[PDB]
UniProtKB/Swiss-Prot annotation, chain B:
This is Glutamate receptor ionotropic, NMDA 2D. Residues 15-179 are extracellular. Disulfide bonds join C113-C168. Component of N-methyl-D-aspartate (NMDA) receptors (NMDARs) that function as heterotetrameric, ligand-gated cation channels with high calcium permeability and voltage-dependent block by Mg(2+). Participates in synaptic plasticity for learning and memory formation. Channel activation requires binding of the neurotransmitter L-glutamate to the GluN2 subunit, glycine or D-serine binding to the GluN1 subunit, plus membrane depolarization to eliminate channel inhibition by Mg(2+). NMDARs mediate simultaneously the potasium efflux and the influx of calcium and sodium. It comes from Homo sapiens. The chain holds residues 661 to 850 of 1336 of the full protein. Heterotetramer. Forms heterotetrameric channels composed of two GluN1/zeta subunits (GRIN1), and two identical GluN2/epsilon subunits (GRIN2A, GRIN2B, GRIN2C or GRIN2D) or GluN3 subunits (GRIN3A or GRIN3B) (in vitro). In vivo, the subunit composition may depend on the expression levels of the different subunits. Interacts with PDZ domains of PATJ and DLG4. L-glutamate binds at S57, T58, D99. It is linked to Developmental and epileptic encephalopathy 46: A form of epileptic encephalopathy, a heterogeneous group of severe early-onset epilepsies characterized by refractory seizures, neurodevelopmental impairment, and poor prognosis. Development is normal prior to seizure onset, after which cognitive and motor delays become apparent.
From Swiss-Prot, chain D:
Changing G38V: In NDHMSD; likely pathogenic; changed glutamate-gated calcium ion channel activity; mutant channels are activated at 2-fold lower glutamate and glycine concentrations; decreased sensitivity to magnesium block; reduced localization to cell membrane. This is Glutamate receptor ionotropic, NMDA 1. Residues 19-26 dip into the membrane without crossing it. It is linked to Neurodevelopmental disorder with or without hyperkinetic movements and seizures, autosomal dominant: An autosomal dominant neurodevelopmental disorder characterized by severe intellectual disability and developmental delay, absent speech, muscular hypotonia, dyskinesia, and hyperkinetic movements. Cortical blindness, cerebral atrophy, and seizures are present in some patients. It is found in: Cell membrane; Postsynaptic cell membrane; Postsynaptic density membrane; Synaptic cell membrane. Belongs to the glutamate-gated ion channel (TC 1.A.10.1) family. NR1/GRIN1 subfamily. Glycans are attached at N68. A hydrophobic region that gives rise to the prediction of a transmembrane span does not cross the membrane, but is part of a discontinuously helical region that dips into the membrane and is probably part of the pore and of the selectivity filter. Glycine binds at S82. Changing A53T: In NDHMSD; likely pathogenic; changed glutamate-gated calcium ion channel activity; mutant channels are activated at 30-fold lower glutamate concentrations and 50-fold lower glycine concentrations. It comes from Homo sapiens (Human). NMDA is probably regulated by C-terminal phosphorylation of an isoform of GRIN1 by PKC. Its phosphorylated state is influenced by the formation of the NMDAR-PPP2CB complex and the NMDAR channel activity. Component of N-methyl-D-aspartate (NMDA) receptors (NMDARs) that function as heterotetrameric, ligand-gated cation channels with high calcium permeability and voltage-dependent block by Mg(2+). NMDARs participate in synaptic plasticity for learning and memory formation by contributing to the long-term potentiation (LTP). Channel activation requires binding of the neurotransmitter L-glutamate to the GluN2 subunit, glycine or D-serine binding to the GluN1 subunit, plus membrane depolarization to eliminate channel inhibition by Mg(2+).
């Protein structure tokens, strides 16, 4: 219950200024844009409703 | 004895069904792009059109996801969002495919019984807006902080409550009784 | 805590249900979020009435 | 309280001849008659509960129309009065 | 005729008093 | 004959008028009873809750220590 009070999404953290930031962020964004994120979500969460 | 219990049970059933239907009203629609209907428009009664205004992120996503759907949805509204909403309200348009935030605000502001589909929670490819700045610009580090510092407070929440609102919360039948009587008489 | 595993060089990429907030973004760097969510109330509740 | 309930009723309304009217207004033939009477009682109970539900079925400055200007509402006050001063200072 | 109107009136009275009582006794 | 008639109409000259009025009263009573049961059958929020804003000993509003929720709570004033 309750209205959402802090609407900030999750994140895959990494050390500051690491060379991977651009690539990790871009790949996460592409997979999220693609069907991969939704597929990984449905089979793992929100799959049960009692 | 038997008849007193019978009339008490009838009274209890009447009250129970009254309270059952009184606190019971909900509206739902198709599941969205995951459905084969959206995947396969060619059916017995093909959808009239899909309102994907081009030159946007929605067009790129739908083209790079379902090329057949993107080709079929060429009967899209060119001028603006408002024209498509008016056309859908009249009835030429079947369903509208567009940015989640703008469509949600339009639903929450526009009057009538028009509602967004149940895919509000199940929004497809949820990415979010942003403030784009020049490549590798030094302004990345401050803004990344500052806007974020806005979010971890009541600033952005209250501002959103101020600007984008309107009510008409995006939440009745009688033929079910006829269906029941037909089933019982059958 | 676990952020010691990243800042102190113990690890090199924090993969977890990490929530984006101010000082964490200050010390370390993040990526684009892969799951949006808020803060919510959990309370035990009994629905039925005999 | 006129023509507020009989919206679907007339549409679905479409020795036994007198018995049907009597039980409507109240061997296997008697069993069928009893079941029909029970069905009619259930139907009239549903009708009265439906009328009850139908009978069972504007805010301050927090109103979105009062916060976001709208042409369907003419939110007017007294010119040059104190209310105009109070409205002049706040931002939205 | 008379009895059908009587039962309809009884149903209306039951519903009306129910909706009345739903918002009484403060 | 009245002893059985009372039970029958409960479970359903001036003597007949009185019986009819009594039956009508019983019907009104059972209708009132069913409406009463209906009304009886017919008869928790976010951070805006006053208990969630003003501390109370009846509620243990607990969270995960050192988590992000603690950080979010640490900055606001009330
Ligand atoms: C980030 O991704 C880019 C894009 O693939 C990588 O750049 C490639 O690096 C390989 C190996 O050095 C080269 O063979 C390719 O020609 C590069 N392509 C481009 C477009 O630059 C980069 O190496 C990646 N960096 C990290 C840290 O993973
Ligand atoms: C997307 O962009 C293209 C590119 O301009 C738009 O195509 C123009 O459409 C207008 C109106 O029909 C014409 O007058 C121009 O000649 C077109 N230009 C080209 C290069 O074809 C298109 O209308 C845009 N789609 C929208 C706004 O929905």
């Amino acid at each position: 219950t309750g209205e959402l009070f802090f609407r900030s999404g999750f994140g895959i953290g990494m050390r500051k200024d690491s060379p991977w930031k651009q690539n990790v962020s871009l790949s996460i964004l592409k997979s999220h844009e693609n069907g991969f994120m939704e597929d990984l979500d449905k089979t793992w969460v929100r799959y049960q409703e009692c | 004895v038997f008849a007193f219990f019978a009339v008490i049970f009838l009274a209890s059933y009447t009250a129970n069904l009254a309270a059952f239907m009184i606190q019971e009203e909900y509206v739902d629609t198709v599941s969205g792009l995951s459905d084969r209907k959206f995947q396969r428009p060619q059916e017995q009664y093909p959808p009239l059109k899909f309102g994907t205004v081009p030159n946007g992120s929605t067009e790129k996503n739908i083209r790079s996801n379902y090329p057949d759907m993107h080709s079929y949805m060429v009967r899209y509204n060119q001028p603006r969002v408002e024209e498509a909403l008016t056309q859908l309200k009249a009835g030429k348009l079947d369903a509208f495919i567009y940015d989640a935030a703008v469509l949600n605000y339009m639903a929450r502001k526009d009057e009538g019984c028009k509602l967004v589909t149940i895919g509000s929670g199940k929004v497809f490819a949820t990415t979010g807006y942003g403030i784009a700045l020049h490549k590798g610009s030094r302004w990345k580090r401050p803004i990344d902080l500052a806007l974020l510092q806005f979010l971890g407070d009541d600033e952005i929440e209250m501002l959103e409550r101020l600007w984008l609102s309107g009510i008409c919360h995006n939440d009745m039948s009688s033929k079910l009784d006829i269906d029941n009587m037909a089933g019982v008489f059958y | 805590g676990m952020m010691g595993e990243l800042l102190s060089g113990q690890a090199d990429m924090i993969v977890a249900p990490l929530t984006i907030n101010n000082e964490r973004a200050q010390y370390i760097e993040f990526s684009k979020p892969f799951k949006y969510q808020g803060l919510t109330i959990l309370v035990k509740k009994e629905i039925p009435r005999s | 309280t006129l023509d507020s309930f009989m919206q679907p009723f007339q549409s679905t309304l479409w020795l036994t001849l007198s018995s049907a009217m009597w039980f409507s207004w109240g061997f296997s033939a008697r069993i069928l008659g009893m079941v029909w009477a029970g069905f009619a009682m259930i139907i009239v109970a549903s009708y009265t509960a439906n009328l009850a539900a139908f009978l069972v079925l504007i805010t301050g400055i927090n109103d979105p129309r009062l916060r976001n200007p709208s042409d369907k509402f003419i939110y007017a006050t007294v010119k040059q009065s104190s209310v105009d001063i109070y409205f002049r200072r706040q931002v939205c």
